[model samples]
Target: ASAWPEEKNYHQPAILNSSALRQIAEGTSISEMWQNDLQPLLIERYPGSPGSYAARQHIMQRIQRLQADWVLEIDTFLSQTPYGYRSFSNIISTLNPTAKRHLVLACHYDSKYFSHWNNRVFVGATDSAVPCAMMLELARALDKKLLSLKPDLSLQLIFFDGDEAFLHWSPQDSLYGSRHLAAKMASTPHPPGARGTSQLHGMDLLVLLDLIGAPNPTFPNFFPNSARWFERLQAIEHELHELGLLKDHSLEGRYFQNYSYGGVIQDDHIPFLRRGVPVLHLIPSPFPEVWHTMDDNEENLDESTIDNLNKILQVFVLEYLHL
Candidate 1:
């Protein structure tokens, strides 16, 4: 499916005002909510490991507890890696499975694998624990409304496993889960009841979250295709600050930077983007200083940053879904 941005679906998302944003935010007490989900995910969870299963279970349990019953699908596969075959599970949850279109919020749930015993225990907080936690928090926060409203653009969350490479970063080793899922979605044939014949064709947008939860991170305008939706994120920040919601968590460059840099730091989005899915990769430009290190743990995750991003993301979801 060699494709480009022109053929991608582009609809103007409804702009969310201050009052609606406040109502949705207050309904869940959006502030200080990331901690609950973040704490449990701060564990060493490389592929084919016990912590990996635990992290998978933790994410499943969190989704299960929400007011809206998520249509959960665990896409587990065994693939040959540099060392040996490793088991990978991509946890997919959809708010409304029957909806014609979808907006995907995604992140990898696995920590980078290391050989040394001390290095093996690395818990990647900003590397992705924070991103996964942020998704869970959004689900919990918007539980009732998302289900009850039944928006046209349904929500789907993908917690991809084995994003980090087993040996070295390459086309083959890195992004095991995303590559597989993208192929699976592309080849899947539907029952004719759903609008689309394949899952890849069902998605309107894929917003990949990574290297978040650190303080004052800058998200460059990568891929002009998603810049419109990215600007909506920037606008959400503006509205929050105007509403006096951001206490001391405002970034001067406004998190979503106007100027572009770094052609694109590849991750899970590459597979889908190649298939023409509109993607907004929200990873910071210069990798977080603590990234991929043993120190990428709970202490390095900034609360203010998490809360601020949460509010922005929540508003973005609401507007996109027109809830």
Candidate 2:
């Protein structure tokens, strides 16, 4: 999909707040809480490098642990020829009675290498820590409630390992995790169910969250594919807006409903979309100055960001899964 914004209006009230963040920051160690309580559980265990290796390990460990209760399966393969042993693993925790359709929520956790221009460690705080961490939180929350709903569609929390290239990202050089998962899902047979022998081939929708941490985050009706899932998205945006969290219905420069920068994301969702996943890559384009720089670290993380995303993911998962 091109990076250009959409035409139709996805206007809705905001569902996030800034003061709540202040309160969380004052009274709680939310960042530490998430890093300590959550990261270890979902992120796979492996060696840490200043680059992508640690991110890959952490993600695999996370999926493995989270899906331990289910009939979990792991798919591993090399990212490329020279990358030796570098593999992309996705943990699948299928619903007992999965709906014919499926929904995938995902993100890439790898931090970018430092950029000399800004002298940053590339911690990827908002760049993705926000979305990646929130995704795992959403998975845990949904895992409990999903059974109660007797959800028809299966839900998977896909964590991509290699989003960033050694430096910047390019179409050919990135999104190894998503690409592999898509290919596998298309060919893999569903264990056996009312949903036919097809595995997770026909995914109804995918909402990819990235850089969604900052207080009063903006989730514009932008990505070219937004129309495919616009109604659901608009509804969620409306709820958030009514609750006073969403922002920017349209961009002024584009002078249309879509307000995000056009195309060129090296993130994970692209791979799935190419293979037929209806995707909504939720990203705050025209990113902050800290993006891809060393300044993207824990100090920039806030409780409000985590809480807000947690809530958003919860709502999104329930609404979509309830169908």
Candidate 3:
């Protein structure tokens, strides 16, 4: 396949500071997090549709039961309806002790209940399945080593269920799991020493991954306050390019343009942001044509897309949180 040729590499502030680079060089196999990954587990749950609610339960139970060497505890939260009686969301956290400050990496695992143009089952493959799976792989790889990180920020791998709508779209119908989780966290008790404050000081960063995983995938540069961080992410892209790692990858042409999804995405990250956690929305704006469509499936996913995203995330976690 032919790829657009260009030698352009932007000169931006170093996203990775001195300590971060040193840590990366000193670190061992962070990629080990991806071994024996469970994406296929999710795939099997929603066999024909884009939504993976059932699969989410399967994952919740599986991870909850496993005694991994790194996983400290797996916490689960149920988002409820207005009556406070009906359960609506599923939010799961895989915590490790090395985590000091907090970092959340999340994506919606549910498939779209309906399809675009009112057609076939929308098995949101690239729309979110791929990114969610990527999140899982990243968590698995980082769990053991995150504590070994230099900065010592606590890392939480969050998987959101019911991020999609059932009949039609509305705030109540979407981000169900995330919204409930955020509200509950805000109302729940903080650390014993946490003083009276609105901001969640411990949450250092929140990165949400969605609409990634394609022969060609890209994420827009995020908010300006986060521009330095976004630039750092771009630098990672360029670094990968120089290392011959991005060649023939979907992420090659995909990069941050100025535009962003201004609306509150019905995603799991929203809850974290509401708690005053600095959030980074990592999404490919103007989501793929296959988004919420039947065309989205493993066929639309590629190893290059998954590997590149995994690499960028691993590097970001190491550089920013030192974990």
Candidate 4:
């Protein structure tokens, strides 16, 4: 479908509190968080670097502090590469482990390495750092409510390791964690209390975020197959726009309402999409100019983009969980 079908029922999301919106929207804090804390640890987090392990530990500790159920850790081994038999870990956390159904919010925490540019640093703020920080903020904002919600609905946040290619972009070099985890999930039988028979099969929906921290990013409806869920996101953006939550004065400056399914984007969601999982790919159509270079750092991020997306996603999640 070129556009969202009319038969689906998508309601305007309830307006969230101003304080709540501002808490997540503060660009200064978000930028500082990325620049001062996450960027330092994540900029060099390729496969075998010390930053890679530190980044994983940092994510683990933060998620643990949220008091959510820390689930499985999928350690991926890269066999038969010049880099040798190196491995990375995928960290999974859940708001309510006992819930039957799950809404998954995922991002890759690893940064890319450029061998040609003297291997200086690819901070990857929009490439994924901001998206990961946004995930943390979402966990911080909604952890309590999600924990206390009914047992039927829950949230799962996944920080995929080794999403960027160490050598070149290919099936073997890229998306190491997602490919391994998807296979494992598809093979393993779903736990006794879970909703579906396997891990990949169990997720109700996957909202994958990428290249989202740029100034006034335009996130079109990337996946028309998941138009119902994408329309819900669009509806939330519209309601936020009407309420002046989004700071963009001009209509085109606002994000997420541009409904153009150009094509599939190659990202962490590919493995899940291949395995029949519903995915809402929240990535910009034309990627930011500083995609994989040394320039993809904290300086390129815009607080307005961070703030608005935070509010939109907060409302979207609340509405999805029916909180």
Instruction: Name the best candidate (by lDDT).
Output: 1
Question: What is candidate 4's local distance difference test score?
Answer: 0.71
Q: Over the stretch 127-245, how does candidate 2's per-residue lDDT look in tens digits?
A: 67667667655555445555454423456666555566653466655666667777777676554442444444546566787876554445555455555454454454455545555
Local accuracy of candidate 1 as per-residue lDDT tens digits, 1-323: 32322233556678776788787656554344554687788888899888999999999998998778698999999888998887899999987776656789999999998755654468888979889988988898887777785534578999999899987798889999999999998786432354446777778789999999777788888877788888888888888877878657555757887877757577999999998788988998788888877778777777777777888898898888877
Residue 89's lDDT within candidate 3 is 45
Would you list the C-alpha lDDT of every candidate in the order shown? Answer: 0.81, 0.53, 0.56, 0.71
TM-score list, all predictions: 0.92, 0.68, 0.73, 0.85
> Pairing residues by index, what is the TM-score of model 3?
0.73
Error of 4 at 218 (Å): 1.4
Higher-TM-score candidate among 3 and 4?
Answer: 4
Model 4 pairs whose backbones collide: 25-307, 190-197
Model 3: per-residue Cα lDDT over 262-282, one tens digit each: 565555676676566667888
Candidate closer to the true structure by lDDT (higher is better), 1 or 2: 1
Clashes per model (N, Cα, C within 3 A): 0, 25, 15, 2
Q: List runs of model 3 lying over 4 Å from the truth.
A: 1-54, 57-85, 94-100, 115-121, 147-152, 197-199, 249-254, 257-266
- Candidate 2 Cα RMSD (Å): 7.9
Report residue 121 deviation for candidate 2 (angstroms): 4.4
